[PDB]
Structure 1
Amino acid sequence: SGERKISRIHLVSEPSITHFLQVSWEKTLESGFVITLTDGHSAWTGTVSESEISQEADDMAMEKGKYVGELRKALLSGAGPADVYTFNFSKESCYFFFEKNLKDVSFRLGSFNLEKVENPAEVIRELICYCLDTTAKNEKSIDDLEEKVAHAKEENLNMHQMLDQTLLELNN
């Protein structure tokens, strides 16, 4: 039903260490998302609704589809080659804001309030369980694919073998 992405990010405030961003949504990012930041000790979580996303796009005067695309690149680690996003977090105000940096100019792409979680260990455990479940699934997919490749390669060798044989029978 629901989907998520966990990404490493660097905060301008705290550049020495890696933080993680966990973003989860229902069907598409457009209908709202839950966003969690953690440093492995504490965690801060907020929610952004569909209407809040649509309002942010309109406030900035960016087309709605483009804005949602920008959130994907910035928040889901989907950035291409020529897109740079910077991330900021105030632990005082619990304000998270990020910018898109172009060659000569940057602009604020979004900003939400992420409140400090009372059970960070619980959030971290659940995050790690998700990673481990994902890995078991991917390992199964790899196994299935390695079997498909083995079978296809066999089918091809045998067909090359029949081609050699046909050539022999054509000569005799």
Structure 2
Amino acid sequence: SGERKISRIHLVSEPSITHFLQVSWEKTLESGFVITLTDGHSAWTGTVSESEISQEADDMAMEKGKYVGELRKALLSGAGDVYTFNFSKESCYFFFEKNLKDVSFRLGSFNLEKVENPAEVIRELICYCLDTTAENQAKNEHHLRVVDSLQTSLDAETRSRNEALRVKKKMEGDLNEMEIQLSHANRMAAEAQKQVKSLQSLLKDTQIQL
């Protein structure tokens, strides 16, 4: 399959012009990669193995993991300015530096052989970009359908929630109305039972004079 990133860069010697850097790899950048520089007309290409990457880390007293991280930030445009790029067409020598404010140091270097079929590389590059844009368009279309579907479900939940809220109020009213009816009945019974007590008392007293 393979993976790639295409980045815009400016060369120290050619500030007015934008160049592109195309880097491609198998599974990880650490396993080795291919790198192509192009302006709109020519192209230069080199290959960096895993061994020469491992070696360059060791040669700079830099931990391998952190070094490959620097490669990612510099070459795959994953940075926060910081990285500068140099190329001489004559020696086909490409090197790049990491910069803090004023202080710089060399991060890496490649020899890039000039390709005799630049237009082919450029066409393949542009094709990659168009394909990618197409796939992204489809994904954007699909997320839009998903969002619409979710908003419709939410609308349904909301409306059903407000409906059940009204039913809850009415049930509670009904419960309360029954409670006051219960109260009434219990009071009627109790008061009548007082009357019963009175009657039994009066009856006893009446019989007792008999």
Q: TM-score, normalised by structure 1?
A: 0.97
Q: Secondary structure at the match of 1:17?
A: strand
> For residues 115 and 76 of structure 1, what CA distance do their matches in structure 2 show?
20
1:46-65 superposed matches below 5 A: 46-65=46-65
Shift of 1:104: 4.0
- Alignment match, 2:162: 164
Whole-Å Cα distance in 1 between the matches of residues 64 and 103 of structure 2? 21
Task: Give the drift of 1:102.
Answer: 1.4
Structure possessing the higher relative contact order (Cα contacts under 8 Å, 6 or more residues apart): 1
TM-score by length of 2: 0.79
Give the counterpart of 2:98 among 97, 100, 107: 100
Where in structure 1 are there 5+ consecutive unaligned residues?
A: none
Distance 1:158 1:50 in 2: 56
For the pair shown, the structure with the greater C-alpha radius of gyration is: 2
Q: How does 1:1-172 map to 2 (within 5 A)?
A: 1-80=1-80, 84-172=82-170
Q: Which runs of 5+ in 2 are unaligned?
A: 171-210
Secondary structure of 1:22's aligned partner? strand
State how many pairs are aligned: 170
Q: Distance in 2 between matches of 1:85 and 1:47?
A: 20
User: Could you say which structure has the higher helix fraction?
Assistant: 2
Moved over 4 A (4+): none
Which whole-Å CA distance do the structure 2 matches of 1:119 and 1:31 have between them?
27
Q: Any idea what SS the aligned residue of 2:17 has?
A: coil
